[PDB]
């Protein structure tokens, strides 16, 4: 069961603008991905502190950077608190709508897009590099979901079949053609110290066999 749905305008613009706009910082996107998994592995640690047993599907709080060449994807594993279906499907995407009006009327007044994140909307920023994102989340409170936007307008929520998470959030970068230079080793470590080297969770990259 594969239900679609329609972007918010708002958020298909800024999708549009993201992807049509000549920008070459476009590595900062992966600065945006892992401050994302940083707020989402503080809100599990905050909510087990009053509640030791949210922590019972997985002790451990960290993020994992996953590049596979074969599949030609990068991806942004976290251990946090996953998101439910409603946050998947209107949920996040309406706190996003205020963010979006910010976020452009200060593009017209001489800001640029490495600035996404001051408005909260730094998820969007993977279309920078990615075609197809795939998004796999688990919430204590909902079942494993799969959500999927390839942009031009729409996007796609289903239950997910596949490897049980225990809970977090999995974001699916399917690279495009030409930016295939963020699957090498090399490259995404210079990102992750230029831009994330302050985070207070152990970042493990994989190595590609
Ligand atoms: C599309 C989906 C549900 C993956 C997200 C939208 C927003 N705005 C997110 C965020 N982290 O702000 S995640």
Same mark, same amino acid.
């Given at each position: 069961?594969?239900?679609?749905?329609?972007?918010?305008?708002?958020?298909?613009?800024?999708?549009?603008?993201?992807?049509?706009?000549?920008?070459?910082?476009?590595?900062?996107?992966?600065?945006?991905?892992?401050?994302?998994?940083?707020?989402?592995?503080?809100?599990?640690?905050?909510?087990?502190?009053? /509640?030791?047993?949210?922590? /019972?599907?997985?002790?451990?709080?960290?993020?994992?950077?996953?590049?596979?060449?074969?599949?030609?994807?990068?991806?942004?594993?976290?251990?946090?608190?996953?998101?439910?279906?409603?946050?998947?499907?209107?949920?996040?995407?309406?706190?996003?709508?205020?963010?979006?009006?910010?976020?452009?009327?200060?593009?017209?007044?001489?800001? /640029?897009?490495?600035?996404?994140?001051?408005?909260?909307?730094?998820?969007?920023?993977?279309?920078?590099?990615?075609?197809?994102?795939?998004?796999?989340?688990?919430?204590? /409170?909902?079942?494993?979901?799969?959500?999927?936007?390839?942009?031009?307008?729409?996007?796609?929520?289903?239950?997910?079949?596949?490897?049980?998470?225990?809970?977090?959030?999995?974001? $699916?970068?399917?690279?495009?053609?030409?930016?295939?230079?963020?699957?090498?080793?090399?490259?995404?470590?210079?990102?992750?110290?230029?831009?994330?080297?302050? $985070?207070?969770?152990? $970042?493990?990259?994989?190595?590609?066999?």
């Amino acid at each position: 069961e594969v239900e679609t749905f329609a972007f918010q305008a708002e958020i298909a613009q800024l999708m549009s603008l993201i992807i049509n706009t000549f920008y070459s910082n476009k590595e900062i996107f992966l600065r945006e991905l892992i401050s994302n998994s940083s707020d989402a592995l503080d809100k599990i640690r905050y909510e087990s502190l009053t /509640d030791p047993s949210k922590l /019972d599907s997985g002790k451990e709080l960290h993020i994992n950077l996953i590049p596979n060449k074969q599949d030609r994807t990068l991806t942004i594993v976290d251990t946090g608190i996953g998101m439910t279906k409603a946050d998947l499907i209107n949920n996040l995407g309406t706190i996003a709508k205020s963010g979006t009006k910010a976020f452009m009327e200060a593009l017209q007044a001489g800001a /640029d897009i490495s600035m996404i994140g001051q408005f909260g909307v730094g998820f969007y920023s993977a279309y920078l590099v990615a075609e197809k994102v795939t998004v796999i989340t688990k919430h204590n /409170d909902d079942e494993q979901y799969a959500w999927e936007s390839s942009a031009g307008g729409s996007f796609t929520v289903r239950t997910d079949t596949g490897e049980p998470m225990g809970r977090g959030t999995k974001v $699916i970068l399917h690279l495009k053609e030409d930016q295939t230079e963020y699957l090498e080793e090399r490259r995404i470590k210079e990102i992750v110290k230029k831009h994330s080297q302050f $985070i207070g969770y152990p $970042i493990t990259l994989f190595v590609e066999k």
